[PDB]
Structure formats: structure tokens, C-alpha cells
Structure 1
Amino acid sequence: ASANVDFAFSLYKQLVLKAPDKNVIFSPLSISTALAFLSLGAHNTTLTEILKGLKFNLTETSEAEIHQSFQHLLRTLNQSSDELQLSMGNAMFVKEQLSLLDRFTEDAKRLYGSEAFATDFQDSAAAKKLINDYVKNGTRGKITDLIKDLDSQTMMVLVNYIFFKAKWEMPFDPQDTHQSRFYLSKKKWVMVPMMSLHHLTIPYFRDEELSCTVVELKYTGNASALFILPDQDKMEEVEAMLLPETLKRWRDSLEFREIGELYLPKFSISRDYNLNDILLQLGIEEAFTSKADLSGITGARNLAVSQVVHKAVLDVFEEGTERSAATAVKITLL
């Protein structure tokens, strides 16, 4: 858990360097679960790079343990449908007539809830629709096309998806939504539906240190949305200090208070990503090269990671929030 948080922020820094001016949106959990799933059939350097990559201290934790921690969280899909929807999913679309260790097969199905689907990668019109139709079903239609182009020498594709819909404890009234200004820069702006709430008592903290303001808006289930609003020209000062300690200082400093007015855009955004470079910058190299030991899958050192892709979607409206994310690890011959 303290690992997933370190991993989320590491990843945050990386994505921003690549495009410092674009929206960022991702699910750390989806990326982690998919890298851990991959770790089943990985050996030696390959195997140790992914776990230290995911931020785990291998002196401390065993890997049989880490697998149980992922198995434990996934079990909490038990989900109470009391104004809260959740569903995670893992899959492995293996090439028709490729043989896997009984041991691989059993571990995926038992620890990650995975399912094995025989897919014919020579027919890429279809193998393509199959994986896209799988992801679309699970995200209930938000992520319509995770897989774009896909080669015929693709041996196997690992897939993870996460769906979450929730209600605000304090919903917004659509009647108080009016087009207003959203400033991209000090001198440039656009017009966006700006929702509002009045005389509301919620968790608050003004961090003079980082020149930003933090507020918590709760959802009925047991999750919360944390909003940080840096002063104009301080977004970079904040991002520079986005670390586990800082997230803890804010949460511990939050105090109840009555806000006269709160304005929040009603919006809907998504990002698409090729994670090869980012994982490489976090130290996961060998899984991509000729040296890849993924022999826990077949029993032979004949498979390598072609690519890792993620797509995430965030909807903010007056009744609640919807977000989904998907990660796919493309696997080829070595």
C-alpha cells in the first residue's frame, strides 16, 4: 500500500516530463495489478526489476506475499451497491495452441482471478475486436478501443480493467451550474459549465507552504475525492513536492470548516498512453530486450514484452463521478 502510493507519484512525475502541459489521468492500481500479474511467469533479473519497479523493498517482503496482497485487494470487489459500483478484471488471451505451465495457468486463475481465452492472432481483424470487446464490456463502454494496431507474431496479451461509479454525499444542484471562466494561463481562458455548492461544511486545509488549498468531497461508498488548487503559477511548486509524506501531511491537516461558496467544473476527460519509456525510467528494462526471462509462463526463455498500454477516463458531473482505466501487456517471441 505504501508502495502503490510511491509508485503512483513516481509515475506521476514521469508522465508530466513527457508532456508538461497536457491533462494527466491514470489508475496506479490498474498498472500495478497488470505488472504483478506479469510477474507470475518472470524469473531472475526480469522478475526482480518489476518488483523493485513497483516500489517494493525485496529485503522485507517475499513475492508469495505480494501476490497475496494483490489477491486480497481484488477480493474486495465484494462491493456494496449502495450508491457505489466497482468491478476489477484480469484476463490472458493466449495464442491458439501455445502451451503454458499448468502451474502458470493455475496461479493466474487463483491469485488474480484471470481467465484463459484462446485467441487467433494470425487473424488481426478479430483478435483485435475480441480484446476491445472484452475491455468495453468491463468498463461498461467508456474505454471503447484500448488495442489499436496488433501484430500477427503476438503470442499473448495480458489485460486488466477497473470500473468505478459513485454518488457525492453532497450532490450539486444542476440549477447552480452556469458557463464561467476556466483559465488555461494568466491571459487565456475558455468557458466551462461551472457547478457550485453553498454554506457547506467539508474537510479543508490551506497549505501556505506549497501555496495551495486542499478540500475533500466524499462519495457514499468508502472513497473520497481530494482536490488540490495551487495559486496561479504554483502548480509546479506543488508538483515538485508530490510525495507520500506530503499526501500524509495534507490528510492529517484537514480540519472541518464552512465554505461560503465552492465552484467545480463539470467535465469529462481521458488519456491514452504507451508506458515503455516510463517503466524504463523506473528501471524495468530486461522484460523488453533479448535478455527477458519470462520462463514461468512457458518453461522456456522465448517470450518478451512488446509493449504496455494504459487508457484512463474521468467524468465529473453533479450527481457523482465515473472513472475507468485499462492496461494491456503485449507479449511476443524471444
Structure 2
Amino acid sequence: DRGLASANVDFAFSLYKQLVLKAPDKNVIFSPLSISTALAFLSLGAHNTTLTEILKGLKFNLTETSEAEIHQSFQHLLRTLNQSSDELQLSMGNAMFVKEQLSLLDRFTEDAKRLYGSEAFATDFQDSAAAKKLINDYVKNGTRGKITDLIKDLDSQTMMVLVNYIFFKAKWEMPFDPQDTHQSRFYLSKKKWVMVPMMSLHHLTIPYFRDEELSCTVVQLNYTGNASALFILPDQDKMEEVEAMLSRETLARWGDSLEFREIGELYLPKFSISRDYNLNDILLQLGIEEAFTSKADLSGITGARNLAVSQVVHKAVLDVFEEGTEASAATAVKITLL
């Protein structure tokens, strides 16, 4: 299948490079699929230039696809990801929290439920602390407690918040033995390091590629199921080069070049990292601008040009350990009257 695949991966790496640009030495963790899905959901309500900019910014080719085909593709992906599974836990949900008095088109609420699985929950944003707790509780529930305070500030004049979450919990195909985890150096720079629990595996046959073009080593560690982790280890002082060359083409070349190798020893830290982002700057850099201004056209939501985006926020957490990985994220689109 993989209809959304090319746009979603182009968007992923465009987003990654912009996130790094803001703080080039910080940890990064985000779900591009959560952000793409939240913005596709937003585009369900958008018209005219507001709509064109969102779909173009999500890296779709608007001369060869329709908005209807895009929404149907997200609907199908959501159904695939949420199907019952015993191998791994994977869940994605969408919701809208809306001021009760705001008139919504029946077409919009019906399409949001049918395509994105989104209910519409009456929310009193004038009681801002209560509205924030409710939205954060929805996200906490969807992420099994891992994304706790997605919404920090919430304007009492907010009219609607669109929310996406993703939850991922998987076991390694080849789990690490905690008896082989030992505190070891992690070099923050060539001459500075800290101590971290370093997991290890011995005589491990996995997909491997030494990339001499980008001075990095790539390995694939599978989960149980159809999911895997691709790990890329740049040589010292080659991280910036690898980052600059990230792209759909580079990812495809890596995948095409992996070959099985019996690794003598693999060392991987046990770690947990978290990041939260205000995505306004990056979305504007990607050309999504009218949705934020007083020219916003979200008239597919209400039937009138009476709404505009105020903020898009994202939070994500990644936890890597001997038995597997837990990762979760959520995206919220805050919308005011116009």
C-alpha cells in the first residue's frame, strides 16, 4: 500500500531539520506521524489558500492528488495502526474539544468522526484550568500516562482544540539481558563524558551497513511485529553531516544497503528522553501561514471564516530499555475566534 508514505517521510525529515536548527545540540524526539495526522485533520476544515498551504506543507503534490484521497488515506492508515495485535501495542487517536455554543457544520463533525475517528467533546474554555485538565487527561489516557502536560497555557478565549496522540510499546525481537547492562561512558563531546547504563548483545546477526558516503554506521534492531528501530551512529563530529543529508532518498539508500552481519558486540544505552515544542515557527517556515493570520479560512468547520489557529504544540517521550521500547507523543492545534 504505502500511499501516504512518501509525503509523510518528506515531512518527517523537513521537520527534523527545522527542529534541530532551533537548538542544534539538544536531544530531539518527536512523532512526525502524529503531527502529519493532526494537520491533515485540521485541513479537513480548511478552504482556499489556508487549505492549499497545509497540504503543500505536509509535502503532498496537489496537482496529482485530491484532498478527498488524502483524508481517505489517513482514515485507512489509522484503521491499520489501531487494529488488534498481540505482538505490540500501537494506538493512535484524534479528538476535538469545542466550545458548546460554537456552531459546527454537520458535514465537518461527521467527516471528523468517519475519517479521523474524532468525537467532539463540549469544553468550557472560559474555565481554562478545567479545560486544560480535560484535554491533558485525554492525552494521558491515550498514552498510558506517558504524555502528561501537553497543554501548558490555554487562552480562555480558545474555541476549539484538535488533538492527536500516538502510543507505541514493543518488545525487542532480540532483547538485551539486564545482567549484561553496565555503567559505561557516553561521550557528549570528544573529551567530555557521563556515565550511562550501557546494554549489550553478543554475536548478534542483524542488518548492518557502514555508510562511507556519510561516515556513519547503520543497524536495524527489530521489534516483534512489523516495526523496527533504525539506529544511525555517525563518526565523531559527523553528526551534522548526517543530519544535513537526511532525506527520503538517503533513508531508501540505507534500507537498500543493509546486509546481515554477525556483530561481535553491540552496545546501546538504556535511556529516556522527552521534548516539547511550539511548532508555530517551523510550520510558518514550511509555508503554513494563512491558518495563523486574520486571513485564515477554516470555513469548512463552521460555514464561516470565523476561526484561526493560535498555536500548534507537540510533546514526545522515548524510553529504550532491555525488554523493548516505549514511545508516545501528542499534537494539539489551538484555535480561536477570528
Q: TM-score, normalising length from structure 2?
A: 0.98
Deviations 1:96-137 (A, max 9, x none): 211100111111011110001000111112111100111000
**Aligned equivalents of 2:90, 2:193: Cα separation in 1:** 36
Q: CA deviation at 1:80?
A: 4.3
SS at match of 1:296: helix
Distance between the aligned counterparts of 2:140 and 2:59, measured in 1?
A: 30
- Displacement, 1:254? 0.3
Indicate the residue corresponding to 2:73 in structure 1: 69
The 2-side partners of 1:185 and 1:194 are apart by: 17
Q: Alignment partner of 2:73: what SS?
A: helix
Q: Residues 82 and 92 of structure 2 are in contact (CA less than 8 Å); yes or no, is this contact kept in structure 1?
A: no
**Any residues of structure 2 matched to 1:204-215 within 5 Å, and which?**
204-215=208-219
Give the SS at the match of 2:154.
coil
Aligned length: 334
Residues 160, 78 of structure 1: CA spacing in aligned structure 2 closer, same or farther, 3 A cutoff? closer
Identity %: 98
SS for the counterpart of 2:121 is: strand
1:289: Cα distance to partner?
0.4
Deviates more, 1:78-87 or 1:17-26: 78-87
Check whether the contact 1:79–1:85 (CA below 8 A) recurs between aligned residues: no
User: How far apart, CA to CA, are the structure 1 residues paired with 2:224 and 2:244?
Assistant: 32
Displacement after TM superposition at 1:332 (Å): 0.2
Please list the CA deviations of residues 129-166 of structure 1 after superposition, one character each: whole Å capped at 9, or x if unmatched. 10011100000000110000111110000000000100
Secondary structure of 1:125's aligned partner: helix
2:326 counterpart (311, 322, 332): 322
CA RMSD of aligned residues (A): 0.7
Q: Is the 8 A contact 1:167 1:321 kept in 2?
A: yes
Distance 1:311 1:17 in 2: 18
1:194 maps to 198
Q: Tell me the distance in 1 between the aligned counterparts of 2:109 and 2:27.
A: 38
Range moving further from structure 2, 13-22 or 82-91: 82-91
Contact 1:154 1:333 in 2 (8 A): yes
Give the direction of change, closer, same or farther, for the CA distance of 1:317–1:245 in structure 2 (3 Å limit).
same
* Residue 59 of structure 1, CA deviation: 0.5
CA–CA distance in 2 between the matches of 1:132 and 1:239?
A: 33
Once the 2 structures are TM-superposed, how far is the Cα of residue 81 of structure 1 from its aligned partner? 3.1
Q: Which runs of 5+ in 2 are unaligned?
A: none
CA contact (8 A) 1:40 1:104 kept: yes
1:236 is paired with a residue whose SS is helix
Instruction: Quote how far apart the aligned CAs of 1:77 are.
Output: 3.3
1:221–1:80 CA distance, 2 compared to 1 (3 A): farther
CA positional deviation for 1:308: 0.1
Write the distance in 2 (CA, Å) between the matches of 1:79 and 1:266: 29
Q: Decide whether aligned partners of structure 1 residues 78 and 149 sit closer, same or farther in structure 2, where only a CA change above 3 A counts.
A: closer
Deviations 1:51-107 (A, max 9, x none): 000000100111100010000000113434323001110000010211100111111
Residue number in structure 2 paired with 1:58 = 62
**Aligned match of 1:2:** 6
The one-character-per-residue Cα deviations of 1:294-333 (angstroms, maximum 9, x if unpaired) are: 1111111110000000001100000000000000000001
C-alpha separation in 2, matches of 1:202 and 1:157? 43
Q: 2:185·2:196 contact (CA, 8 Å) conserved in 1?
A: yes
Q: Secondary structure of 1:263's partner?
A: strand
State whether structure 2 residue 253 is matched by structure 1 residue 244.
no
How far apart, CA to CA, are the structure 1 residues paired with 2:92 and 2:33?
10
Contact 1:294-1:304 within 8 A present in 2 as well: yes
Deviates more, 1:78-87 or 1:321-330: 78-87
Name the counterpart of 2:173: 169
Which has the higher mean CA deviation after the structures are superposed, 112-121 or 73-82? 73-82
Mapped partners of 1:196, 1:79: distance in 2: 33
Query: Is the alpha carbon distance of 1:78 and 1:22 closer, same or farther for their aligned partners in structure 2, counting shifts above 3 Å?
Result: closer
2:274 equivalent to 1:270: yes
Question: Secondary structure of the residue that 1:287 maps to in structure 2?
Answer: helix
1:202·1:256 contact (CA, 8 Å) conserved in 2?
Answer: yes
Q: Take 1:8 and 1:169, find their aligned partners in 2: how far apart are those partners?
A: 26
Structure 1, gaps ≥5 residues long: none
Number of the residue aligned with 1:306: 310
SS in 1 for 2:156: coil
Deviation per residue, 1:190-210 (Å, 9 max, x gap):
000000000111000001111
Deviation readout 1:208-257 (Å, 9 max, x if unpaired): 11110000000001011000001111111111110111100110000001
Q: Which runs of 4+ in 1 moved over 6 A?
A: none
**Residue deviations 1:271-301, cap 9 Å, x none?**
0000000000110000000100011111111
1:97 aligns to what SS in structure 2?
Answer: coil
Mapped to 2, the partners of 1:212 and 1:59 lie a distance apart of 37
SS in structure 2 at match of 1:142: coil
Distance in structure 1 (CA, Å) of the matches to 2:218 and 2:68: 38
**3-state secondary structure, aligned to 1:233:** coil
